[PDB]
Ligand binder design. Structure first.
Ligand SMILES: *[C@@H]1O[C@H](CO)[C@@H](O[C@@H]2O[C@H](CO)[C@@H](O)[C@H](O)[C@H]2NC(C)=O)[C@H](O)[C@H]1NC(C)=O
Ligand SMILES: *[C@@H]1O[C@H](CO)[C@@H](O[C@@H]2O[C@H](CO)[C@@H](O)[C@H](O)[C@H]2NC(C)=O)[C@H](O)[C@H]1NC(C)=O
Ligand SMILES: *[C@@H]1O[C@H](CO)[C@@H](O[C@@H]2O[C@H](CO)[C@@H](O)[C@H](O)[C@H]2NC(C)=O)[C@H](O)[C@H]1NC(C)=O
Ligand SMILES: *[C@@H]1O[C@H](CO)[C@@H](O[C@@H]2O[C@H](CO)[C@@H](O)[C@H](O)[C@H]2NC(C)=O)[C@H](O)[C@H]1NC(C)=O
Ligand SMILES: *[C@@H]1O[C@H](CO)[C@@H](O)[C@H](O)[C@H]1NC(C)=O
Ligand SMILES: *[C@@H]1O[C@H](CO)[C@@H](O)[C@H](O)[C@H]1NC(C)=O
Ligand SMILES: [Cl-]
Ligand SMILES: [Cl-]
Lengths: 429, 429
């Protein structure tokens, strides 16, 4: 019998981490593995039906995706949906699959709202989610003694899936929930020179521990401006929330060869970069090789190296986790459409996949690991100094390296005389 | 053969102008008329299948409505959808019906966005729409010589269909488009005493011709505060955007018997009320009688008098207009599922219904008539002095009455020395 998987992803646009040009070969690799395991899905064959989350303009849409999901549902009666990856596309589709009582698996849709499973019943996220970034920051603040305040600056592109907004929204709610610190925040538009005076003023007025979600160039410009304004590593720390490591390729993220590298290097003495952790089990490197090969040969697409590859790898691992859950359900006398039973076997469970160890929490979302990159004083090069395990919630040093603090130890998150020092008797020096 | 009409409306909640307790009897009345007209729908019988736009909490929802529409579509293959009425419910349903190429008729969903028919293809609105309010204001400003500025203040209830927001959004875009005046605007929360200082300051600083969308009590309080601050009818005019005439029951909207009626009457010398026009053809009064009777006997609901009744009357008239369009389509050899052909016969067309004359514009939206209520100097009572025909776009005086201006003529929309008079030489007096 056929186990039909309904896919709703960007079938023609290849620019997303979850675009079919990347996810398609990853899924094919997972299915080829299933076919070679007679113990898996005894008596069933996995079949795929494809639908696109894209509108006429070629971008993931909050309307095209649900229209596609309904069409697939009606025509093929799928047992499970794979995707969408975009937050705006997955929100409406997930409400339909919940209503239909059909599981939905995705390594995308990291937004806070998708985490409300009373609404998104049967939605299992096998990739990163933004509230998990909040868990990492919570751990960082506790380890460094920051219990009072932080500022978050962020920018996105006019009409996209608003990645930075959702990153900050998840970080904000979770950090506020666990640390109860004041979290000031504000958006800006990267190409608007009018916003720089406001940002620099907000940095001085509202925070000492600062998080910035922006392009690599916007972060570098802000650091150069901070250095020129005399905001150094003794009093400030700037964390670039660069989950996919776009500013990384030794790593010298401050280098451009534009006549400002000496200043940029100096300015980065006060910066650290937060990224998803690069899987480092040997099975991942082999998957990457097979992924690139198949993507090139059967999907006409060149898959470049980078952290974005954890997404298709997570669709691969998630589909295998689902397969295991269904195999166990059949074994116990249930069937492939027992949505609740199958989902219950995926949540609050560990699994070994190409991305290594992976744990799905009790709310149906995968625990996410992060890496903190810091500067090597001697060379100015950046390297990972701390890794965060999202399951144990422990921060572990890497290679005996210690965190770099320009003049000693971490700056306090509140200035000696407060942010709005109005006490003539308090000497800020 | 059966012509199936899929309904997606509030089936259990009776508080909406488009709730089934009101719309259901209105539709029944229209169907009984069709059954008595053998010339209509030769060989077809209209059948109704019902779905609710309500979520578990009993309010119209942006999710329950489309889930219901899909369920109805699948199970009954309807030829046309009736409803939703709520803006948040109709937006997603309309995108589905457009995709399915099935007509959607509604006397609700007045929001600006629903007017983009490239998206909401086949959606025909037979009731009021908010951009039409913009047409009325345009006409008013031209007649009174207001070519520069206006201020709009508005408030809604925490999680409703945000009626005032959509009213102002439609007014703003259309007025800006046709007059190119500056339109300042701002929201407030009615029960928050903290907002009154800000509102009164914005009135002084930003406008002389002011529009307010709020509850009857919030408008009265604002008028009493304006009078106390010395803002009179010589320099200010306050238009209460009360489309359904909630502040009306002679009409003395300023009366409460709370010890402030003398002041309230005086304060209202500077106020006028904008409402939808009450249909005044004899067929409307008879429809109202039949509606109340049937609603009480078959739907267990007491239909009170009021302008909200134009909504069920417009679902009644719209369904008959649709019937006429389909009858003509059949006559020409087409069939009940020729969505485009049927819709084309409804747009840019006049029709006679219980609400009297009704014209559907070229964009598929009904032209809306409005009434302006003004104070009678002698009694302080309010009465209609001007009526606006949305098709001809002409303003016509009623009963030889003229507009009331406390001290002569309309106040100018810009103060003599400008809003921020900084010219020491200009005497505001
Ligand atoms: C594929 O997706 C990308 C990203 O969404 C599209 O690029 C954007 O296109 C929109 C138009 O809808 C522009 O307003 C943005 O400036 C573009 N942003 C980025 C980051 O590229 C792209 O056009 C889509 N289509 C194709 C064929 O690639
Ligand atoms: C992250 O931390 C968790 C600790 O809970 C590690 O999970 C354990 O992994 C071992 C070996 O895979 C299992 O035998 C245990 O059952 C796991 N414990 C739990 C509670 O699930 C996990 O290995 C760590 N991740 C990495 C990359 O080291
Ligand atoms: C029917 O609809 C009304 C209006 O939407 C509901 O009343 C609101 O209920 C919400 C809860 O979802 C409250 O937050 C609001 O304060 C209420 N506003 C108003 C104007 O009533 C009502 O509860 C719904 N259900 C029923 C049975 O009437
Ligand atoms: C609103 O104005 C329009 C003027 O265009 C009136 O419409 C005319 O109505 C008469 C009688 O019903 C028809 O013979 C004409 O064909 C209509 N003209 C057009 C252009 O459609 C309409 O009657 C007015 N409304 C009211 C209540 O008087
Ligand atoms: C959270 O901390 C702030 C001060 O940092 C305090 O005012 C507030 O009361 C705390 N939260 C709660 C729920 O008390
Ligand atoms: C609209 O009017 C304003 C001043 O009232 C003017 O500055 C503006 O240029 C006008 N619109 C356009 C498109 O020129
Ligand atoms: Cl997607
Ligand atoms: Cl509705």
């Amino acid at each position: 019998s056929d186990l039909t998987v309904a896919v709703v992803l960007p079938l023609t646009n290849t620019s997303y981490p979850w675009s079919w040009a990347r996810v398609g070969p990853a899924v094919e690799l997972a299915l080829a593995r299933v076919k070679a395991r007679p113990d898996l899905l005894p008596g069933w064959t996995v079949r795929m039906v494809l639908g696109s989350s894209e509108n006429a303009a070629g971008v993931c849409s909050d309307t095209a995706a649900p229209l596609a999901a309904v069409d697939l549902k009606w025509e093929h009666s799928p047992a499970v949906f794979l995707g969408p990856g975009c937050v705006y596309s997955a929100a409406p589709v997930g409400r339909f699959t919940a209503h239909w009582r059909v599981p939905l698996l995705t390594a995308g849709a990291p937004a806070l709202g998708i985490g409300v499973k009373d609404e998104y019943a049967l939605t299992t996220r096998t990739g990163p989610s933004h509230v998990k970034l909040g868990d990492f920051v919570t751990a960082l603040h506790r380890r460094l003694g920051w219990e009072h305040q932080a500022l978050v600056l962020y920018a996105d592109r006019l009409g996209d899936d608003r990645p930075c907004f959702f990153i900050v929204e998840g970080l904000y709610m979770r950090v506020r929930e666990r640390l109860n610190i004041t979290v000031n925040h504000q958006e800006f538009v990267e190409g608007d020179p009018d916003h720089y005076p406001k940002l620099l003023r907000a940095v001085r007025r509202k925070g000492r521990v600062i998080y910035i979600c922006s392009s690599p160039d916007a972060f570098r410009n802000l650091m150069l401006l901070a250095l020129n304004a005399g905001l150094t590593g003794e009093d400030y720390v700037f964390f670039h929330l660069d989950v996919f490591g776009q500013s990384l390729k030794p790593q010298k993220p401050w280098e451009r060869g534009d006549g400002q590298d000496r200043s940029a290097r100096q300015a980065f003495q006060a910066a650290k970069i937060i990224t998803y952790k690069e899987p480092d089990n040997p099975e991942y490197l082999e998957f990457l090789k097979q992924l690139k090969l198949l993507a090139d040969k059967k999907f006409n697409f060149t898959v470049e190296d980078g952290l974005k590859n954890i997404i298709p790898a997570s669709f691969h691992d998630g589909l295998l986790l689902y397969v295991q859950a269904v195999t166990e359900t059949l074994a116990q006398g249930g069937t492939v459409t027992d949505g609740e039973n199958i989902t219950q076997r995926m949540w609050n469970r560990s699994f070994q996949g190409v991305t290594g160890y992976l744990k799905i929490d009790r709310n149906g979302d995968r625990d996410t690991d992060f890496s903190l990159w810091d500067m090597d004083p001697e060379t100015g090069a950046f390297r990972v100094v701390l890794n965060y395990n999202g399951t144990s919630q422990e921060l572990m040093a890497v290679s005996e390296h210690k965190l770099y603090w320009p003049l000693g130890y971490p700056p306090p998150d509140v200035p000696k005389c407060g942010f709005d020092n109005e006490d003539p008797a308090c000497n800020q020096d």
